[PDB]
């Protein structure tokens, strides 16, 4: 059993529709999300509590039930096309990528 896994994985997206990414984990707990672009350090998007991270321009949101958390991104804006990762304490997922 892998402690933290992500889905759907890399997908094509169309701007104007709202994105949805999701991941699951062993046991239960708070979960958080980061955004990463090539050549750059990652940045925090959502606090592990699901509260929006400071400095984020109100395009990101999410919630959880059971062992699963879902992240959504407003209107699939191209500015946010990036690698995305889940984190649960010590573990990181394999990540996903936004394409078009």
């Amino acid at each position: 059993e892998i402690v933290l896994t992500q889905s759907p994985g890399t997908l094509s997206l169309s701007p104007g529709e709202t994105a949805s990414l999701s991941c699951t984990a062993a046991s239960y707990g708070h979960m958080t999300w980061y955004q990463k672009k090539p050549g750059q350090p990652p940045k925090l998007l959502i606090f592990a509590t699901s509260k929006r991270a400071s400095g984020i321009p109100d395009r990101f949101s999410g919630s959880q039930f059971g062992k699963q958390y879902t992240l959504t991104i407003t209107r699939m804006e191209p500015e946010d096309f990036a690698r995305y990762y889940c984190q649960q304490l010590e573990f990181f997922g394999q990540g996903t990528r936004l394409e078009i």
Partner: protein, 125 residues
């Protein structure tokens, strides 16, 4: 989005040791409970290495493969941190990052609010 000042990059021979370090202003450093290190290998997801406590210097590593080859230190009067890696192998080529957490309440999960630009270590012939 405050950046941590990161040390430079370079290339090492197998078996060589290397030091990686980062610096901040005193009003950034004092607020930090833990300084964490992570590794980003090409083609891989992000890997946790370990952390050092800013107050006591206590260290908690991830895989034992790091524990035997990695030592973490901190210096509160210089507002810095250092990572000492020994026994480098070709499999250790990766970008390494300095990152920090200022959350003092449990049950809130881990956070990495601050990041350095990171540095590249290349191990080769």
């Amino acid at each position: 989005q405050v950046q941590l000042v990161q040390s430079g990059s370079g290339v090492k021979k197998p078996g060589a040791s290397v030091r990686v370090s980062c610096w901040t202003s005193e009003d950034i450093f004092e607020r930090t409970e833990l300084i964490h290190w992570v590794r980003q290998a090409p083609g891989q997801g992000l890997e946790w290495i370990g952390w050092v406590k800013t107050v006591t210097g206590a260290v908690n590593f991830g895989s034992p493969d790091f524990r035997q080859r990695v030592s973490l230190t901190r210096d509160r009067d210089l507002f810095t941190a250092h990572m000492d890696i020994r026994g480098l192998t070709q499999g250790d080529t990766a970008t390494y990052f300095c990152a920090r957490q200022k959350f003092y309440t449990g049950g809130q999960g881990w956070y990495f609010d601050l990041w350095g630009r990171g540095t590249l270590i290349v191990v080769s012939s």
